[PDB]
Each structure stands twice: as structure tokens, then as C-alpha cells.
Design a protein around this ligand. Structure first.
Ligand SMILES: Cc1cn([C@H]2C[C@H](O)[C@@H](COP(=O)(O)OP(=O)(O)OP(=O)(O)O)O2)c(=O)[nH]c1=O
Ligand code: SF4
Ligand SMILES: [Zn+2]
Lengths: 1010, 306, 66
DNA sequence: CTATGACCATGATTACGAATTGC
DNA sequence: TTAAGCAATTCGTAATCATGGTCATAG
């Protein structure tokens, strides 16, 4: 629809180009100037034109040591290494490499690993023509033949085999989303006859570019173009949609320029004639071929930078591609920027111990960038459900019906289009509100990796990139060590608690950035690790090296500076600047998203240390990891000895303090005073006192005062939070307990939060007992919503769940009769509830889908929920304040309340009536019993105040759907399984149905036909 | 050894392979390949540490070991490959830790593995313990794998019965030899043509490569350069091995001092352990037990349900 | 039949007769006739040549827990 | 028609894997 | 060709081991 502005008057012999790049690309090419791999770079100007840039003359290489013989110091054998062996038996050694310009170069460099000296050594630099020839050469120089005139006897290892685009960016100092400049007279626009579809197309040599480091005025962001879209399909009853039978009926698109607070384009393309919508364009077609063609032409002409959505990768784009393949439309799958290239669906998997394992499809688009917001949420955030409704409530606050809204009239289709446009608008709001893209651009500028790697890869490519960028400045080469496999080492210490309930303030002192500052201030690195022999026979121990608790020796900083101290120092300053910016916000959600930014930079700095100990990886050095955790243990026991030893009764102070807890970075010391001001004063004195026994940047700091405190086990405690004194209290802290885990029911987590509220804030155990009694009583009397009963568990890799029978695996692998095409896959979460049956050996035989127990009305196992979900967390919490008469107190508060329980063949009812007063079954329909007839005015009085309260609950719920829907004049259709509103509006109809019929036992209060 | 062999069997005659527990081997005398063994431990006191512990574990379970060394190597493929271009120190350091533990040892005339088989097929020992399926090729009836694995790696030992392999593949030893060659012998280049499973079939209706070649002949399945498909087929048959009867192995009693005075001392290593070790070795002095019915009744055959 | 089942499905979604997914089909037909909006005399003449069948005398979504 | 222990049936203890959170 | 680490607590299922109620038959 709307086009980009027109590039007026660029003349290359006088004017430069200044543009900001988004994507890079590799390309094997003809039309050479009179190398074959030429590079592509796509970007945008400071105004809004689209620029493609072709870069020429770059070829991959690596290094290898020159062996000590008469060969690789003699030029005849250098060019003979270039020369091929013409023998017949060298077909395995000069064919797959063959005649390639590997070349011969002599340079003086060093290896990374260890500390041998300040002296370098000769290495050979071996270029290669193509990037897809470094793999057979590696298969032909190490295990292949290297008998060539006795120049290089096998073997010499390969060093610095890295990726092509990463080697380009390490070479020329270009980072992700960078400002690039072509100077005047260096670039030719009309040398390249147009093979792509951008406006400006330059054709430059790889030594002409100028990279501007992002800082000062070069810290801006260009006006990018962002698209979001959503589709609709018309299915059958029960049957989930399939790309060979179910047509695509509506596509809806939103588009904006980045930096402007509203969109500028709003389009909706439908398949029958429709009705107009104010604010958007509407076009209609009588066939699906025109609809797919129209969308492909719009996406070529608008030419967006970024494409977003929600689950567009695994649902939307391959559905469109398969549907275009079935209907024989040849011109659809050309969505990219290159004019002669069609797109294809390709599977990929990712797995780690940090995010688990996920299997995704990818679809190829060259030039353009994809950001599915579902994958960003699934990677960064740990939530309970990952539906669009659930995250839109958590962050903002909100198939067979559609097939008859489309086979109807045109106002129904207009309603369908407004629904689809709201769906297509929600991920834009989430992208701009959560500060996604600004943090992605800052991550790519601090680490130096492209913008597509932050959605596909892990935390290794970034630390490899930063280490290579720091390695070119002193002249070192990296080695290739690979081992399967070493052993584990010893991790962190935890101090033994003094368990219980405390009501005198405890002050928390901890170290900030512990492991990066250990690695900084004792000069630990790959490049300064001293081997056990190379100290000998030199004897200089003092101020030349140090010794660690695991046992290594490491050189002092008066000889070398390591590489990991400098990378860590850069990351630490970036996080410090993020916190300094975060210290001046007032909005809460903005404060937590800047907390998210600084959390991400601290995770990056700690993953630098975790790179060293990963024995399945790219470069492990477990000696360093052992030295780190040994220093950690030594320093925390130093802290505990010092804190408990100095402030004592004989040293003039009030009370000898005693440490109650410590977990590898923090110390919770109990001081003795019950005044929060005096505890805060002595705690600040203690933190600042103890910090002066270390190198720098090692510092201990005061952080909080808990008052009161509740310590249950290791990694399980709770307390109340004081930041200042006249800032009285902030909130609770629930470390580890049953309120922050997601393996349980909402009922149990709510009861634990409410019990700690009534028990820590108001200090009333009697209201707490009465609360827990009411929860158990309302459980047994069958008046608890089934939202509070849903359990969710993650469906991981299928073989560990083959090894032992679980409940959620049994529910998932059991398909439905309605739909063998929508079922949980690997990596998602399965929700279930437990119904009552008589198979007590197996709780995996009583699990059912919440919607299935909704539509089929199966009962609930209240004894399962009473003794297996609720009871034992309560016995954790309520015991330490009292004795074991407290277990008997809650099991007796159960006992007064356990005696109140509410209740094929089911069709053959008799429906025996019963007396309302004393429950005696009898013949006839009158409500009262003959012995209990006098007390009938009181028994009518009783239960009409129950009908009165059910009437008041019907009306508050069924008009809330009208305000959440938007309209007051049309029907509600919302079966949202993540809304408490749904199925709480279903049971009050039946309560009212039952309670209205019980009062017609009594006669009518008058006539009605008068 | 032979390439992709284990998988081939596993995939076409699993009845010849069993996953037994190290304990079930109590009372068995086994022939080991010291060379490979010594190597396994390395991949420098390891060449003996493992040569220590492991042999103790092999003893503790009733298994009576006999380490074997190689002599003058023969014409192995990659072996004499660098010759196309033109030590025993930590080795014998083991031939010592053994007799000092009362454990036999034999100097094979060439390839131990062949010698091991030589024994096994003479009743002089139960099975041969290596990691290379070669032994099977050499005619050995029983081959045990993993018997030298770390106490940690809870891997069970893998047994192989030649007479069961030959059974399924319906082919004599020799016929089996050719298969190993076309499967990937470490003596001569295989034939780029045939695949693992493919190589079997051919041999099945062509009791020799000599007949397999003359058949398939296009430039679509060419036969190797200097193919010694013959020389090899011979080695696997009549190798160079010390006569079985030539000697009688006798497990002696370990000499605590003389040895511990040549270990924890001369090679420095935690005394407390190598002491309790020599102690344990001295305890487990035996293995043979419970006889089989085979030992007294000839096997009639097999009754197969209708 | 199979043409009479689309006429009723077309009467059920025309907005000028009312917002009807809680009641029967003939009750909505008589409600519009009282107010006399314009009920057509064909959605009546198939609700008379049938007995109490639940796929003629019921709204489209008379399943569906809404 | 009546003692005795052998036999079936039901409940208490231990072991280990899976899931998830704290540093 | 691809993947940052370790410590600790909780719960469910199958298997191991203890103990009583019938019963079956020798006295
Ligand atoms: C959270 C976390 C901690 N650690 C280690 C490194 C840390 O130095 C040590 C302390 O944990 P943390 O206190 O969580 O982190 P931190 O001390 O480094 O930073 P800050 O005080 O500002 O919050 O625990 C990891 O190795 N990986 C991790 O993911
Ligand atoms: S049931 Fe009602 S309140 Fe709940 S989400 Fe649906 S429309 Fe909104
Ligand atoms: Zn009564």
C-alpha cells in the first residue's frame, strides 16, 4: 500500500552513503571483477530508503603451526604445500581439496592456553577459496595425507576454525545493528544491474567501509518498518485444521514505523463480500487464489523490515505455503528480498539445561527479520500458561463457530474481521510495552553478534565472539581441545540453619557480583594459567604467582593481564549503567522491565564463568572453575567467623551475635536488638567493616532487615522486608515455598499466602485457624471452583517419561475421539484435574482434561485434594510456632469440620423427597415433616436468604461478560479456559435452578391469573 | 578390528550376543589383549593403575585373567602406510606389576588377539577379552567386551558366540572371514561398493569375495587398488600364534611388600589404597565353580514347536 | 431437507429479528411478529410440517456451553 | 470333631527417578 | 553440526518385607 519515499539525487563521486545494517548474507557468485564468495548487507538510511550493499574480495582462512623440519621454512616447500601431488594414490588427498588457493603465509603468533612465556613462534596462515572447503581440508590435513616432500609430517592441529560472517565482523569491527559508511568515490551504484528489489544498490570492495562505534550521536535507531499479521481458517466439527482441506478465509495486517506512537497502516483481506470498518481498508475476493496473490503483492510493495506475530512460525507461514502449493498458484512463495528465490520449510531443534528442549520449523526470508513473540516469552519468562489470553491478562488485563460466522451474512463477517484485527494488534502492543526490541539492539551492540542469533542460539557464540575480539589486540590464537568426558567438581557450600520462627530482627549482608570479581581480582585466565612444571626451575614465588585452595598456581598481574578480566569489566560497567538508569523511574512495570534488562546483563556476566566448566562445549578449563568455588567457600566461612567473633558482650557491645544462616553469597546474622533502627545501624557498620579485608572490587553490603523471620529448611524461608526505617515495610519474601512454584494447585498457593499474611502481618493465629477451617469446609461441601483445582506439568523429552509412568504423560498420549490433530507436543504444559475412582494404586489413572470434565461432568476426589495436596504444606508452616499439639489442633480443626460432607444406573432414579427439617424420606410432596411442622415459618425464613444471595451472584457475573465483550446488544461467545468468568457463570445457573425448585415445595404466595 | 560388525550382528543375529553381569563370569579363565588394554587405561601411572585396580576387580568376581602382549606385527593396512612415506617402556612396566600379583602373561608371536583366539579354541581359556571384534574373525568361539572397563562405567560385559554368528549367517568361518573383510578389515581396504547389510547377502550366495567380484563388475562397484583380499583372508585363518598347549598358566600369590615397595614407593601413589588393594587381590584367590550339564551330557539338538 | 436446514440457519443470524441464543426458534418467530418487524411466511411453514425434532426446533448453538 | 502350620491376602519401608527452584 | 554451571528439596510408583484370616488335614 504506502510506498517508501523516493531516493532523489545521490551521486557517488561526490556523496557518501551512511546507512544502518540489519541482516548480512553469504553468496557464491559469478560476475567477478576483471573471490567467488561475495557478501550481502541490507539496511536503511537515516531517512527511510532501503539499501542493499554487495561486498567483494573476502575469503576464509585459518592457522596451523609450521612443523620443525626443512619444509615450512623453505619457500620451495611452501609453494609445494600449495602445489598438488600428481600421484595416483593421492586421489584421496588432492581431489576434494584439489586446486584451491590455500596459499602459504608466515606469521609470528602464540597459542592461548596456558602461560609459557612472552615469546611468540612461527605459524602458517592458510587461506581457502570457499567457506565450504574448510571441512574437507580438515578431513584431509589431519587424518588425510600430509606426506608431501617431507615438509609437514602428520600431525599439526588446526587453530581458529570459526564461522564466516563472524570472522568478517571480527576482522572489520562491525557489530550487530551498526552504522556503516561508504566514502566518496569508493562505491558504484550502477555497476550492479538490479538483482534484488531495494532502492539503493551499491557494489563496494571490502576494504572501503567505515564502521562507526555506537556511542555519542551514533547511538540512535533508524525508522524501521514493522508488520504484524494473523489468519483465519474454516474447519470441520472436532477436526483441527489441515492444510489440504481447510481454506484460509481472512488475513489481517497492522504496520508501523518505529518511533511513532500509532500505526500507519491497517488492512484486512477477506474472502466473501463484507461490511466497512472505520479506520481500515477492506477488500473482497471471490476465490482464494486472488487472496493469496493480493497478500504477496502487498508484502512485496510495502517491503517491511521486521515481521512479528504470535505463533506465526509453527502455524501461520507453513499453512500459507502448503495451501498455496495445493491450489497451484506459482507466484506465492517468493516473499523475500532477492528477486529469483523461493521459500521453503525446514525443521530445527534446540536444547539446553537452561530452557529445556524445543522443536520448531523455520521458513526462509532473505533480507527480512522474524520475531515471533511466543518464542521470546518462552525463552525469557517462567509463567504458568503461555496462551495469548493468559499473558495478556498477566501483562495488560483482559473454530466451529467461525465456520458459521463465515457461511452467514456480511455483518457476521464484519464481526469476524474486527476480532481478527484485535488479535493481530495485541503482539505489537506487547512488543513496544515490554521493551523487547530496544533490549535486543543493546544486546547485539554489547556482545557483537547479529540480530538473528538472539532468537536461535545460546550463550556460547557471544562469549566466543567477545573473546576473539579481545584476542586480536595482543596476537594470540585459540586452540581446539575436546574431551568426552571429565568428571564433576565440588560446588557451593550452604551453612547449617538454626530452624524455626524468629521475632527479633536478622540483618542480611551479601557480596555483589561474587564470581566475576573473584575472576577479576586474583588474575585468573586461560592465558595466565601456570602449568605445574613451568614454574620450575625458577624460584620466584612472592608477588609473581599465587596459590589457590584446589591447588593451582596463577601468575600475578605484574607479568600478565588476562582476557576474561577485561570482558567481565566491560559487562560489569554496562550493567552498572543500566542500574544507574533504573534508579530514576517511578512507574512499576517500567521499573521491573529495567530490572529485566539488568538481570540479562548479570546473566551474561555469570555465563562467562560458566563457559569454563562446560566439559561439553568449545573450550573447557575446569582448573579455573575449581579455583573459583574454592575461593567462594573460603570467603563465606571467613565472613561468618568474623561477624560472630567481633561484636560480643566482652567487646563493649550489647549482645554476642550468632549467625543463623548462610547460602554461598549471603549471611543472615541475628543481632539481638528488637529496634529496627539499631539493627540497621549496626548492620551497615558490619558490612562496611568486613569489606576491608579483601582486594578490590570485593565488597560486602547491607541489604535488608527481616522482622519477623521464618526458616523452614535449606532454600525455604519467609520474612517481612524493611528497606529504610520511615519507609516502614515493603512486602513479604517467600523464598522457595509453596506460593512461587507451579507444580501445585492455585488453591494451595492462595492458602499459603493468606496464612502467612494473617500470621506475619496481623499476628493472629486464631483467624488463621478459622481461615484454614473455612477453606477445608468449603472444599468438603463442594463449593470450590475448578479453576482452583487445575494442575499443570511440562511434557519434556519422551524417553525419560517412557522410563516411569506419570499422570500428564498419560493424559497427553491418550488422544481424544474428537481431535487427533490437536494434542500436547514436546516442551509445552499439560493441564489436568484428578477425578474420584477406586483405583488407588495409580493417580495416573484418575486424570482428565478440564474441558472434558466440564462438558461430561465427572466428580472430584476431595480426599485426594485434602490429604495429598493441602495437608502437608500446612504441617510444614504451622508447626514451628507451637508444638505437636498444633498438628493435633489443625487435625482437630479438620475434625470438627470433616464431619460436614456434601454428596448408566444414574438414569433410573426414583427421586425420593425428603423433609427439610430432619431429613426423613417419606411419601407425599410436602416440604415439612409431621413432627417438625410447627417450626415452618423459621424453616421458610431459612433458605430464602440463600436464594436471595444466589440471585445477587447471577447478575454480577452475566453482565460482566457484556462489558468484557464490548457490546450490550448481541450474544456473548467466549469459552476462554483461562478466564475464571467461564464455568463460574455456568454453575450458578444450576444452583439457582435447584434452589428455586426447593421453594416451590411451599405453595405460591398468591394467585397469578387475576 | 572389524568395522560396523557389532552393529551388523546386533541387527541380524542378536541371539549370539548377551548382556551378562561381571559376576556370572566367576571361575572363568580369560585371555586379554594387554596391548589394547594398556592403551585403554592411558586414553603417567595409569598404564599400571588400571592394570592394577581392574585386574583386582576381575579377580574379585572369580575371573582368572591372563594378559597377552603382541610380538612382531604383520602387514596391517594403515600399519605399513607411513612406510609409503619413508615405547615398550611403560609396556613392560606392566609385565612386572603382573607377576608381582601372581598373574600370568604371554608373548604372542605376533598379534595377541589371534593368540587369544588360539587359546580359547583349545579349552585353555574361556573367552578372549578385547574391544576389537577381530577375535571372532580369528576363529575364537567366545569374545567378551568391556571386561576392562572402569568400575564406574556401570557397563555390563558383552559376550559374543562365534558358533551362533556362523549359525545365523549360514556360513563357515572362512565364509565369515570374507564378510569381515568386506565389512572393513584393519588389514586391507574394503570395497567401496557393498554396504554392511549388503556385504552379508552377497557372501550368502557367493561363498567368497573371489566369486563376488567376478559377478558385480561395473565401474559402479570397482574393486580396490592393491587389494590383498587374499593375504588377509589367510591371516584371519592361520595366524602367527604361540601353541596353546605350549604352556600352563598358574595364578600365583601376590607379594605385598616386593610389590608395594615397587608401587607406592618407586612410583608414588596413595599407600592406604594399594595396600587394601593387594589385600583384596589376596582374598579372591579362585573363581571356577558350578559345572554345566554340557560338561557331562552331549547336546542332542533342538525340539521346535509345530 | 438439506435446503430447509439452511433457511433456518439464515433466519437465525439475521440481526433485524433479535439477539437470539437463549430461547426456542418459534418463540423468536412470534416475538418478531408481535412487534411485526417482518417475519417471513416460510420459516413458519417448516415449523408446522414437523414434530418436536431438536434439529429444527432449536437455535444453532443449543449445545456449546455459552 | 478338633490343633497345627502352610497358604493367600493386605498393609508398612525402602529406593530411585522426575520436576522445579535457589545460588 | 549443536548445547553456560552445581546444590537441594519434594512427591509418586514399584518392589521388598511384616503380619493376620482362612483352611486343610492329621490326631
Ligand atoms: C543466579 C546465578 C548465580 N551464580 C553464582 C555467581 C554468582 O557470583 C553467585 C551469587 O549469586 P547471585 O547473588 O544470584 O548473583 P551476583 O552476586 O553475582 O549479583 P547480585 O548480587 O548483584 O545480584 O552465584 C551462577 O553462577 N549462575 C547463576 O545463574
Ligand atoms: S467468560 Fe466472560 S468475563 Fe470471562 S473472559 Fe469470557 S467474556 Fe470475559
Ligand atoms: Zn421432619
Amino acid at each position: 500500500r504506502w510506498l517508501r519515499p523516493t531516493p532523489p539525487a545521490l551521486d557517488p563521486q561526490t556523496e557518501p552513503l551512511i546507512f544502518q545494517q540489519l541482516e548480512i548474507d553469504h553468496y557464491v557468485g559469478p560476475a567477478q571483477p576483471v573471490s567467488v564468495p561475495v557478501l550481502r548487507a541490507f539496511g536503511v538510511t537515516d531517512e527511510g530508503f532501503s539499501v542493499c550493499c554487495h561486498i567483494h574480495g573476502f575469503a576464509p582462512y585459518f592457522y596451523t603451526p609450521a612443523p620443525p623440519g626443512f619444509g615450512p621454512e623453505h619457500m620451495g616447500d611452501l609453494q609445494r604445500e600449495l602445489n598438488l601431488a600428481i600421484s595416483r594414490d593421492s586421489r584421496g588427498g588432492r581431489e576434494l581439496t584439489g586446486p584451491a588457493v590455500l596459499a602459504v603465509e608466515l606469521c609470528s603468533r602464540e597459542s592461548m592456553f596456558g602461560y609459557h612465556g612472552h615469546g611468540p613462534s612461527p605459524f602458517l596462515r592458510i587461506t581457502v577459496a570457499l567457506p565450504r572447503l574448510v571441512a574437507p581440508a580438515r578431513r584431509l590435513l589431519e587424518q588425510g595425507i600430509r606426506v608431501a616432500g617431507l615438509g609437514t609430517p602428520s600431525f599439526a592441529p588446526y587453530e581458529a576454525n570459526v564461522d564466516f560472517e563472524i570472522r568478517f565482523m571480527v576482522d572489520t569491527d562491525i557489530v550487530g545493528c551498526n552504522w556503516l559508511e561508504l566514502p566518496a568515490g569508493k562505491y558504484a551504484l550502477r555497476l550492479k544491474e538490479k538483482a534484488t528489489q531495494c532502492q539503493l544498490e551499491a557494489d563496494v570492495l571490502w576494504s572501503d567501509v567505515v564502521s562507526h562505534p555506537p556511542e555519542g550521536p551514533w547511538q540512535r535507531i533508524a525508522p524501521l518498518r514493522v508488520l504484524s499479521f494473523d489468519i483465519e481458517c474454516a474447519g470441520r466439527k472436532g477436526i483441527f485444521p489441515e492444510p489440504e482441506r481447510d481454506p484460509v478465509i481472512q488475513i489481517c495486517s497492522l504496520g508501523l514505523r518505529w518511533g511513532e506512537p500509532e500505526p500507519f497502516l491497517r488492512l484486512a483481506l477477506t474472502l466473501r463480500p463484507c461490511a466497512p470498518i472505520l479506520g481500515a481498508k477492506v477488500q473482497s475476493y471471490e476465490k482464494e487464489e486472488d487472496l493469496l496473490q493480493a497478500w504477496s503483492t502487498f508484502i512485496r510493495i510495502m517491503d517491511p523490515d521486521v515481521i512479528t506475530g504470535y505463533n506465526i512460525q509453527n502455524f501461520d507461514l507453513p499453512y500459507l505455503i502448503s495451501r498455496a502449493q495445493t491450489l497451484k498458484v506459482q507466484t506465492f512463495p517468493f516473499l523475500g528480498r532477492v528477486a529469483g528465490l523461493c521459500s521453503n520449510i525446514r525443521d530445527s531443534s534446540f536444547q539446553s539445561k537452561q530452557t529445556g528442549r524445543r522443536d520448531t520449523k523455520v521458513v526462509s526470508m532473505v533480507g527480512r527479520v522474524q520475531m515471533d513473540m511466543l518464542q521470546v516469552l518462552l525463552r525469557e519468562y517462567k509463567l504458568r500458561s503461555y496462551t495469548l489470553n493468559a499473558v495478556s491478562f498477566h501483562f495488560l488485563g483482559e473454530h466451529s463457530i467461525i465456520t458459521d460466522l463465515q457461511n452467514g451474512n456480511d455483518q457476521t463477517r464484519r464481526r469476524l474481521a474486527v476480532y481478527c484485527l484485535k488479535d493481530a494488534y495485541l503482539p505489537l502492543r506487547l512488543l513496544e510495552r515490554l521493551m523487547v526490541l530496544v533490549n535486543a539492539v543493546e544486546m547485539a551492540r554489547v556482545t557483537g553478534v547479529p540480530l538473528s542469533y538472539l532468537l536461535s542460539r545460546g550463550q556460547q557464540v557471544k562469549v566466543v565472539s567477545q573473546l576473539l575480539r579481545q584476542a586480536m589486540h595482543e596476537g594470540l590464537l585459540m586452540p581446539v581441545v575436546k574431551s568426552e568426558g571429565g568428571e564433576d567438581y565440588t560446588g557451593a557450600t550452604v551453612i547449617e540453619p538454626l530452624k524455626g520462627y524468629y521475632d527479633v530482627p536478622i540483618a542480611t549482608l551479601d557480596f555483589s557480583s561474587l564470581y566475576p570479581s573473584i575472576m577479576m581480582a586474583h588474575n585468573l585466565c586461560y592465558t595466565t594459567l601456570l602449568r605445574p612444571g613451568t614454574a620450575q626451575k625458577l624460584g620466584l614465588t612472592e608477588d609473581q604467582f599465587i596459590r589457590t585452595p584446589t591447588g593451582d598456581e596463577f601468575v600475578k598481574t605484574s607479568v600478565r593481564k588476562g582476557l576474561l578480566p577485561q570482558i567481565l569489566e566491560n559487562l560489569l560497567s554496562a550493567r552498572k549503567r543500566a542500574k544507574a538508569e533504573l534508579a530514576k523511574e517511578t512507574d512499576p512495570l517500567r521499573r521491573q522491565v529495567l530490572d529485566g534488562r539488568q538481570l540479562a546483563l548479570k546473566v551474561s556476566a555469570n555465563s562467562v564463568y560458566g563457559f569454563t566448566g562446560a566439559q561439553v562445549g568449545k573450550l573447557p578449563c575446569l582448573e579455573i572453575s575449581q579455583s573459583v568455588t574454592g575461593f567462594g567457600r573460603q570467603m563465606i566461612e571467613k565472613t561468618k567467623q568474623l561477624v560472630e567473633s567481633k561484636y560480643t558482650v566482652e567487646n563493649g557491645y550489647s549482645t554476642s551475635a550468632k549467625v543463623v544462616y548462610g547460602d554461598t553469597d549471603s549471611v543472615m546474622c541475628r543481632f539481638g536488638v528488637s529496634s529496627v533502627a539499631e539493627a540497621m545501624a549496626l548492620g551497615r557498620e558490619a558490612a562496611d567493616w568486613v569489606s576491608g579485608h579483601f582486594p578490590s572490587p570485593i565488597r560486602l553490603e547491607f541489604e535488608k532487615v527481616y522482622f519477623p523471620y521464618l526458616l523452614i529448611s535449606k532454600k525455604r524461608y519467609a520474612g517481612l522486608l524493611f528497606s529504610s526505617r520511615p519507609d516502614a515495610h515493603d512486602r513479604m519474601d517467600c523464598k522457595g515455598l509453596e506460593a512461587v512454584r507451579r507444580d501445585n494447585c492455585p488453591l494451595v498457593a492462595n492458602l499459603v499466602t493468606a496464612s502467612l499474611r494473617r500470621l506475619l502481618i496481623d499476628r493472629d493465629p486464631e483467624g488463621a485457624v478459622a481461615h484454614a477451617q473455612d477453606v477445608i469446609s468449603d472444599l468438603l461441601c463442594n463449593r470450590i471452583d475448578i479453576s482452583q483445582l487445575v494442575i499443570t506439568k511440562e511434557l519434556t523429552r519422551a524417553a525419560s517419561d517412557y522410563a516411569g509412568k506419570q499422570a500428564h504423560v498419560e493424559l497427553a498420549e491418550r488422544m481424544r475421539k474428537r481431535d487427533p490433530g490437536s494434542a500436547p507436543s514436546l516442551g509445552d504444559r499439560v493441564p489436568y484435574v484428578i477425578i474420584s475412582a477406586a483405583k488407588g494404586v495409580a493417580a495416573y489413572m484418575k486424570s482428565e482434561d478440564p474441558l472434558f470434565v466440564l462438558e461430561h461432568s465427572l466428580p472430584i476426589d476431595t480426599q485426594y485434594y485434602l490429604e495429598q495436596q493441602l495437608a502437608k504444606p500446612l504441617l510444614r508452616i504451622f508447626e514451628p510456632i507451637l508444638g505437636e499439639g498444633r498438628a493435633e489442633a489443625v487435625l482437630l480443626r479438620g475434625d470438627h469440620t470433616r464431619c460436614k460432607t456434601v454428596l448408566g444406573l444414574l438414569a433410573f432414579a426414583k427421586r425420593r423427597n425428603c423433609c427439610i427439617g430432619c431429613r426423613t424420606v417419606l411419601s407425599h410432596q410436602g416440604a415439612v415433616c409431621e413432627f417438625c411442622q410447627p417450626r415452618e415459618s423459621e424453616l421458610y425464613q431459612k433458605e430464602v436468604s440463600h436464594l436471595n444471595a444466589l440471585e445477587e451472584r447471577f447478575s454480577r457475573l452475566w453482565t460482566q461478560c457484556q462489558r468484557c465483550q464490548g457490546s450490550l446488544h448481541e450474544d456473548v461467545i467466549c469459552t476462554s479456559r483461562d478466564c475464571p468468568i467461564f464455568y463460574m457463570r455456568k454453575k450458578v445457573r444450576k444452583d439457582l435452578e435447584d434452589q428455586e425448585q426447593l421453594l416451590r415445595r411451599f405453595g405460591p404466595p398468591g394467585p397469578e391469573a387475576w | 578390528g572389524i568395522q560396523g560388525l557389532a552393529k551388523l550382528i546386533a541387527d541380524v543375529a542378536p541371539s549370539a550376543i548377551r548382556e551378562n553381569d561381571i559376576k556370572s563370569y566367576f571361575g572363568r579363565k580369560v585371555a586379554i589383549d594387554a596391548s589394547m588394554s594398556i592403551y585403554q587405561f592411558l586414553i603417567t601411572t595409569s598404564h599400571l593403575m588400571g592394570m592394577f585396580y581392574r585386574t583386582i576387580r576381575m579377580m574379585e568376581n572369580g575371573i582368572k585373567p591372563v594378559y597377552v602382549f603382541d610380538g612382531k606385527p604383520p602387514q596391517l593396512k594403515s600399519g605399513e602406510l607411513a612406510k609409503r612415506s619413508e615405547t615398550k617402556q611403560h609396556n613392560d612396566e606392566c609385565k612386572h606389576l603382573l607377576s608381582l600379583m601372581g598373574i600370568p602373561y604371554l608373548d604372542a608371536p605376533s598379534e595377541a588377539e589371534a593368540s587369544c583366539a588360539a587359546l580359547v579354541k583349545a579349552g585353555k581359556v574361556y573367552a578372549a577379552a578385547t574391544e576389537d571384534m577381530a577375535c571372532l574373525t580369528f576363529g575364537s568361539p567366545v569374545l567378551m567386551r568391556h571386561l576392562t572397563a572402569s568400575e564406574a562405567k556401570k557397563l555390563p560385559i558383552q559376550e559374543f558366540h562365534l558358533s551362533r554368528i556362523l549359525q545365523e549367517l549360514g556360513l563357515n568361518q572362512e565364509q565369515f572371514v570374507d564378510l569381515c573383510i568386506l565389512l572393513g578389515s584393519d588389514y586391507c581396504e574394503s570395497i567401496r561398493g557393498i554396504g554392511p547389510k549388503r556385504a552379508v547377502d552377497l557372501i550368502q550366495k557367493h561363498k567368497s569375495i573371489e566369486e563376488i567380484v567376478r559377478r558385480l563388475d561395473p565401474n559402479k562397484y570397482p574393486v580396490p587398488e592393491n587389494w590383498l583380499h587374499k593375504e588377509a583372508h589367510q591371516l584371519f585363518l592361520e595366524p602367527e600364534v604361540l601353541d596353546p598347549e605350549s604352556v600352563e598358566l598358574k595364578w600365583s600369590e601376590p607379594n605385598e611388600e616386593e610389590l608395594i615397595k615397587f608401587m607406592c614407593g618407586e612410583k608414588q601413589f596413595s599407600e592406604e589404597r594399594i595396600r587394601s588393594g593387594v589385600k583384596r587381590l589376596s582374598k579372591s584367590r579362585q573363581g571356577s565353580t558350578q559345572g554345566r550339564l554340557d560338561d557331562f551330557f552331549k547336546v542332542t539338538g533342538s525340539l521346535s514347536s509345530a | 431437507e438439506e435446503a430447509e436446514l439452511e433457511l433456518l440457519r439464515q433466519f437465525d443470524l439475521a440481526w433485524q429479528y433479535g439477539p437470539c441464543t437463549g430461547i426456542t426458534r418459534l418463540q423468536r418467530w412470534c416475538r418478531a411478529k408481535q412487534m411485526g418487524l417482518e417475519p417471513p411466511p416460510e420459516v413458519w411453514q417448516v415449523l408446522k410440517t414437523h414434530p418436536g425434532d431438536p434439529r429444527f426446533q432449536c437455535s444453532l448453538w443449543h449445545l456449546y456451553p455459552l
